[PDB]
Write a protein that binds this ligand. Structure first.
Ligand SMILES: Nc1ccn([C@H]2C[C@H](O)[C@@H](COP(=O)(O)NP(=O)(O)OP(=O)(O)O)O2)c(=O)n1
Ligand SMILES: [Mg+2]
Ligand SMILES: [Mg+2]
Ligand code: NA
Ligand code: NA
Length: 326
DNA sequence: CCGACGTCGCATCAGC
DNA sequence: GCTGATGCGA
DNA sequence: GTCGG
């Protein structure tokens, strides 16, 4: 929390450019700058000091100078006052409602929680469930609850087929004491980069989790990625646990290390690592790491026998999950 | 200065 | 229906 | 908004 004031400011600016201006690269730029400042081990004295950090340029340095002198930012103060920006920023907090849909809802005079609730018929399925659990999705999940959820998921997965391996990644794997949601990486020996010897591999697990009333809703569902809602069982006379977002990603068993590297994150860490990979002449996704031929096409997948192997190729010293919280 | 910015899954829609 | 683009999100 | 070339 050394420079929390600055990083909060930059984060708010990031969200503005993403939601209102619809400038995804300004959003990324602000996110990058906020991240590098967050890990800077000194209380920042000036914008000039901050500008030394990669990702922090002239404009942000100026904003930091304003914030240090006054404790606020005029650009942000104005943004907070603008009705259209405020309306759009609120609407986008509903899962499924993005910058485009939010701006469209505003045009139609749909701009409040009350407006949304009396107009469910104008929402797609994702958006409708997002509204349904708007309050719950705001809530953090204590690691203690994450542990309970992990036990249920792993044990139910084991019941379907013993050869399944379920790994909880995301912020949980990085050792966070609280998480925004649950992310589960799934493998089965019948699904490799070479072939798929069994149908409905992801479907079967989802079905089982629904059958025991753990998974409660589905936002989207394909052959390799599930996005939905889950809830811990409560005891007699106890108030119910909040509903939680859960993602399940099926990844070819032989490509587990690239898969777990991706799903562990963090999101900015992945962006930074993959950017570094490009500079070193590689490209990394959740499946492979590939060389980039001089032309610009990705070459053949390189052998990967650990998360560390991926770090080695791009000449980065290995970083444990707990040190990837950027 | 200025091109490019990490990479991809699922839902949705446009055009044929 | 297929293919490709876009929106949204992980 | 930032920056490597
Ligand atoms: N922008 C993004 C979003 C998702 N991810 C892949 C890796 C992110 O760390 C990760 C899990 O997504 P997430 O749940 O939205 N974020 P994360 O799990 O790190 O922290 P929480 O908000 O759950 O506590 O998925 C990514 O690489 N880049
Ligand atoms: Mg998560
Ligand atoms: Mg998630
Ligand atoms: Na800089
Ligand atoms: Na949203």
């Amino acid at each position: 929390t050394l420079n929390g004031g600055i990083t909060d400011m930059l984060t708010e600016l990031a969200n503005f450019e993403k939601n209102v201006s619809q400038a995804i690269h300004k959003y990324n730029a602000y996110r990058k700058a906020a991240s590098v400042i967050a890990k800077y081990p000194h209380k920042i004295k000036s914008g000039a000091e901050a500008k030394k950090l990669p990702g922090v340029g002239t404009k942000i340095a100026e904003k930091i100078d304003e914030f240090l002198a006054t404790g606020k930012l005029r650009k942000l103060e104005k943004i907070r006052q603008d009705d259209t920006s405020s309306s759009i920023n609120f609407l986008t907090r509903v899962s499924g409602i993005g910058p485009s849909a939010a701006r469209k809802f505003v045009d139609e005079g749909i701009k409040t929680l009350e407006d949304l609730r009396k107009n469910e018929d104008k929402l797609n399925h994702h958006q409708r469930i997002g509204l349904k659990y708007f309050g719950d999705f705001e809530k953090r999940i204590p690691r203690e609850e994450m542990l309970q959820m992990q036990d249920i998921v792993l044990n139910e997965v084991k019941k379907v087929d013993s050869e399944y391996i379920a790994t909880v990644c995301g912020s949980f794997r990085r050792g966070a004491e609280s998480s925004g949601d649950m992310d589960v990486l799934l493998t089965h020996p019948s699904f490799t980069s070479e072939s798929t010897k069994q149908p409905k591999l992801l479907h079967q697990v989802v079905e089982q989790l629904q059958k025991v009333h753990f998974i409660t809703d589905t936002l989207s569902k394909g052959e390799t990625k599930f996005m939905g809602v889950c809830q811990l069982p409560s005891k007699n006379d106890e108030k119910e646990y909040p509903h939680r977002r859960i993602d399940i990603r099926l990844i070819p068993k032989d490509q587990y290390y690239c898969g777990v590297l991706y799903f562990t994150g963090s999101d900015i860490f992945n962006k930074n690592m993959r950017a570094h990979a490009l500079e070193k002449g590689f490209t990394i996704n959740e499946y492979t790491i590939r060389p980039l031929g001089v032309t610009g096409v990705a070459g053949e997948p390189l052998p990967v026998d650990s998360e560390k192997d991926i770090f080695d190729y791009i000449q980065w010293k290995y970083r444990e999950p707990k040190d990837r919280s950027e």
